[PDB]
Amino acid sequence: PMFIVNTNVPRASVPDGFLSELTQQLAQATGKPPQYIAVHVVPDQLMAFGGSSEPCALCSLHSIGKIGGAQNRSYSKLLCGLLAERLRISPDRVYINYYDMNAANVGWNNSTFA
Amino acid sequence: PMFIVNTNVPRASVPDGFLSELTQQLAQATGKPPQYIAVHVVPDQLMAFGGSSEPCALCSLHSIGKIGGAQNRSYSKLLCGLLAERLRISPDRVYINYYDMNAANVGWNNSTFA
Amino acid sequence: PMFIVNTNVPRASVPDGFLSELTQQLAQATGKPPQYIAVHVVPDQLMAFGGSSEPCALCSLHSIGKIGGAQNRSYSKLLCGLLAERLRISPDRVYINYYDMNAANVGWNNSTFA
């Protein structure tokens, strides 16, 4: 998994340990080793959700498989959970776009995963 | 709709009002309640288009359906129009990537839209 | 092609001419005129790869065609190569998501490419 969070929450509100926590929890959730997982948090963004500038997040999760109805519902519960607990963002002010990438369409280490 | 604009125009050149305007215009254009609409503007970016650092924008619009030939042509007119009028970006220096998301592949409120 | 790189490398470490070099090299790789090529570099990011905050990058390449097994392998070698040489990022700490966009789903100059 690679997970990207873009939020209007300020940098000083992202707690120490957050990228490590995301990494571990995504490892646990996907049954994938943590060495594969990438995470990225972009705070201080100029964003709105429903025309409001209260805390919100626009996120992406990309995986090579392990994407599907049930799996995505569990990922959304985990990730909204974390964003609510650590960043004080309401789950109904979060979108997470999920992408099932073909191995041939993911570059890594001078080649692809195909 | 959720609309993201990345641009090398400076923060101070983004009008107060712009996120609200995008939200309202997007609501009009899609017929979606504005409560569902998210917008995000990212100024000051290190970017080039055609090798030039003249104002430009890289954007995305994600929707659950309501994406297709005619619809995307109308969105591109609307959104290039706004970026030209408000951020003084030439329409020929804008890209908009459109994504028709499956409901099961959009997380929100601890679950998905499926 | 449009290429976006997000990295925890600091802005001061991005050398002069980097966006110009990406443009020119992407033109060469895809055969496409540099005039349509967009590039975007986002340094100083809060990111981790494999649970580690060593230099890393998460990137995307969108093209209307010119995406496929061998092409993307070639692009990955090219781009990981530039990121290593210029930003001192190890190739094994780079992910590049490739997107073959339908021409109907790419907005430019008030319309789409369909």
Author numbering:
A (entry chain C), B (entry chain A), C (entry chain B): 2 to 115
Give passages from the manuscript.
Macrophage migration inhibitory factor (MIF) is expressed at high levels in various inflammatory diseases and cancer. Macrophage migration inhibitory factor promotes directional cell migration (or chemotaxis) of various cell types 2, 3, 4. Unlike canonical cytokines and chemokines, a trimeric MIF molecule has three tautomerase active sites at the trimer interfaces 23. Although the enzymatic activity is vestigial, there is accumulating evidence that the active site is important for receptor binding 24, 25.
To structurally verify the proposal for the inhibition of p110γ and p101 expression, we co‐crystallized 1, 2 and 12 with MIF. 1 occupies the bottom half of the catalytic pocket, whereas 2 occupies the upper half. However, this steric hindrance theory does not explain the inhibition of MIF‐induced migration of THP‐1 cells and HL60 cells by 1 that does not have any solvent‐exposed ring structure like 2. In contrast, MIF:ISO‐1, MIF:1 and MIF:2 show relatively increased B‐factors (>10 Å2, >30 Å2, and >25 Å2 respectively) for the L2 loop. As MIF:1, MIF:2 and MIF:ISO‐1 inhibited MIF‐induced leucocyte migration and increased B‐factors in L2, it is likely that structural stability of L2 is the critical structural determinant for the chemoattractant activity of MIF. Pro1 attached to 1 revealed the longest displacement (1.9 Å) followed by 4‐IPP (1.1 Å), 2 (0.8 Å), 12 (0.5 Å) and ISO‐1 (0.4 Å). This suggests that 1 might disturb the protein the most. The displacements are 1.1 Å for 1, 0.6 Å for 4‐IPP, 0.6 Å for 2 and 0.5 Å for ISO‐1 and 0.2 Å for 12. This suggests that the displacement of Pro1 upon inhibitor binding within the tight active site pushes and destabilizes the L2 loop, resulting in suboptimal MIF binding to receptor. 1 inhibited 79% of the total number of neutrophils otherwise recruited by MIF.
